Design a protein around this ligand. Structure first.
Ligand SMILES: COc1ccc2ccc(C(=N)N)cc2c1OCC(N)=O
Length: 246
């Protein structure tokens, strides 16, 4: 997250912190994710496509720091890593950039809802918020494009939804951004999601209710002028989510 503010997991209790185990025992942060039901975390396929071995991943719920244990955090393995069969990557655009992670503790249980661990409601079909609506993003991603390390503390920011027509303008992404993608940025281009925030939530308040409107997917640079953050539009994927969670 470029700009924005440091936060803690109690303000984002659906946020999942996903890491990968390496040969030799080192574990590095991969991507964010969101708890949509006690057994299921929703993230982005590009996060896992080059390393699709479910056994390598660790997911945390109720965790506020990158390399520290948060009081009340819960650790899980991935029982099932489901990547979208039609995921593809162009030079910039990532297609069908959605994934599901069935989580389990070492005792074989799913998440236990608490003050710092909660689900995020899925959106309804054909009912996304209008362009101009402010939404929040969360992640452990870079604070500057030039950084090679991630912040130790979780961050959050607020961005505004950009219409498909604006995002398809030639100085923006042209025909590379599709109707299955949602653009969101800062009108002053000072705050954004960045590398490391992929898979994480774009949460919008719709008719007074908090919803997982998007999933961090792709963008040209970070907080660059006319280069919005591009998010997987979750409302298009409700038939796919419902079919793979049962
Ligand atoms: C691999 O790096 C990523 C991966 C995912 C991203 C996702 C979103 C954004 C954004 N500008 N909001 C930037 C991202 C990003 O940085 C853009 C880049 N490397 O040019």
């Amino acid at each position: 997250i470029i700009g924005g503010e440091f936060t803690t997991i109690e303000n984002q209790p659906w946020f999942a912190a996903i890491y990968r185990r390496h040969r030799g025992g080192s574990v590095t942060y991969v991507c964010g994710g969101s708890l949509i039901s006690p057994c299921w975390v929703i993230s982005a396929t590009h996060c896992f496509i080059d390393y699709p071995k479910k056994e390598d991943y660790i997911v945390y719920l109720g965790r506020s720091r990158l390399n520290s244990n948060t009081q009340g955090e819960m650790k899980f393995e991935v029982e099932n890593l489901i990547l979208h069969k039609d995921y593809s990557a162009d030079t910039l655009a990532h297609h069908n950039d959605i994934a599901l992670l069935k989580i389990r503790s070492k005792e074989g249980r799913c998440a236990q809802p608490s003050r710092t661990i909660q689900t995020i409601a899925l959106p309804s079909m054909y009912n996304d918020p209008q362009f101009g609506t402010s939404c929040e993003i969360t992640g452990f991603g870079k604070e500057q494009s030039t950084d090679y390390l991630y912040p130790e503390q979780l961050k959050m920011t607020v961005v505004k939804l950009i219409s498909h027509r604006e995002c398809q303008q030639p100085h923006y992404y042209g025909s590379e951004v599709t109707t299955k993608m949602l653009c969101a940025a800062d009108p002053q281009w000072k705050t954004d999601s960045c590398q490391g925030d992929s898979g994480g939530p774009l949460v919008c308040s719709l008719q007074g209710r908090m919803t997982l409107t998007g999933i961090v997917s792709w963008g040209r640079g970070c907080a660059l002028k006319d280069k919005p953050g591009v998010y997987t539009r979750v409302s298009h994927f409700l038939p796919w989510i419902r079919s793979h969670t049962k």
